[PDB]
Amino acid sequence: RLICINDYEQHAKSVLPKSIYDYYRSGANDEETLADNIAAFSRWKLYPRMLRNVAETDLSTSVLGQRVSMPICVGATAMQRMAHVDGELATVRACQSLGTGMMLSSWATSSIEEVAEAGPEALRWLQLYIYKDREVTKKLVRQAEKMGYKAIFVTVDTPYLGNRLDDVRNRFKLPPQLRMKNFGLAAYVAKAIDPSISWEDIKWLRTSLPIVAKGILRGDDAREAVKHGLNGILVSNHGARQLDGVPATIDVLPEIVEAVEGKVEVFLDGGVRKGTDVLKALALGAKAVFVGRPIVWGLAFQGEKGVQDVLEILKEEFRLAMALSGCQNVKVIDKTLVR
Template sequence: MSNNNKFISVKDFENYAVGTLPRTVLGYYQSGACDEYTLSINNKAFNRLRIVPRMLRDIRNRDLSVTIQGDRVNVPIGISPCAMHKMAHEDGECASARAAGKHGAIFILSTLSTCSLEEVATAAPNTVKWFQLYIYKDRDLTTSLIRRAEKAGYKALVLTVDAPVFGIRYKDIKNNFSLPSWLKLGNFSEELSKMNQTNGSGLTKYVMSLFDDRLVWDDIRWLKRLFFNLLISI
């Protein structure tokens, strides 16, 4: 079987990853928090979706394009932010953004990307890109990230507010998960670009030490005042 025929469905990619990725990396990509109840009901929710058929329609000129927050995209799909793509592919988020653009989808880059937001912008100039943001305790660092995203052409901020405390991810704790030593977080320099190799989850320790767990609506108003040109999705 040729490589082109090996991957027909999303499940084919998942099966390949299960047989290829290191245990710690696979555990991070696959797992949810605690007993994965929320992950389970999310999957069930997607499985409940059904296509509503429209019979006897002329389908010779189909158009799936939509306008989302002012940008016309070919399909009503966005690639959600997921951290650390280079653990699975050498080109990391640059490759993911190019693929999204090739099919006319929106790509949302994670703050914890293994490629810098500038690298992704250069690699995928024609892709509609949004930037997912965690608000750091260091507001100057947070402001710097947003200004860089704005300068690089990202069209919107996707602000994560539902994680004042990071989820207890059992697999990450058991696997002592951390970003592999040969990789770094592309949007940062020096010590912020690395995760310490420690017992338990290095990702959890990183998040809890740096992300602001005291966010309130005043922080959203602060963002809007500073960056009124960027759309903010929460």
């Protein structure tokens, strides 16, 4: 049945309620960046090397000094219990099985402690939104710290929610038996999230956990994050759900890698569906990629097992792409592989 990520999305459309599928699928406004996140990867062509000996392809790498089994990690996607009853518990168990990391949404349908309990041995990080209530915000960080999360991904591209048209048409809401368990979405954001935050707030947040700035699209902003003692950059346009008409993340990734001059790790999300997508981002300088929507589609198919399958498909696609490209490990993936 389901042999590639696209298949999982098709299945999901077939089993999910419309307002839920649309919430997860949608981009902002006319969805130009949504389409481009995908299309851009196709414009970067691969130049494989032959005869390199690829008999035992090692996908292992590290993320902020924590080993992972592959440079493909789960990105924050809110409210996963809308997709499968088990939601984030399923996701973290799948990550534990695979040996990769999970970035937990601040707006998760399961709490920080809950997810830690379901995936003790999993590498886990907290995506943080800066709430107008800074005591709320601080408590989220302190609970992450206590419950063994290894980094904070602070989202910096959402002072307001992007305008996702289908959510407006559908009057998007949580299903009744569900809540954001650590405590319509546009209005939520307007009420709860602080549109005033600045670089001064980044200074405030600089916990001893590593901090990654999530949502950077400009080299000058990347340099500023370095200057503020952050420990990484997640090149992200928020799944094309915030400002429409920004470039594809794979197209802005070279500027940002350049700008940071190797001082922090650079990650990418947005449009990763295939193992060659992973290869291209590593070639251009990313240490690892995050996948958002594919994980929700995995949940929609079969909860933990579905997410494990989506990650295993990506792992195998990436292995094959590495092998056919002449790469026996992630350290040998270089910029001559792409043009």
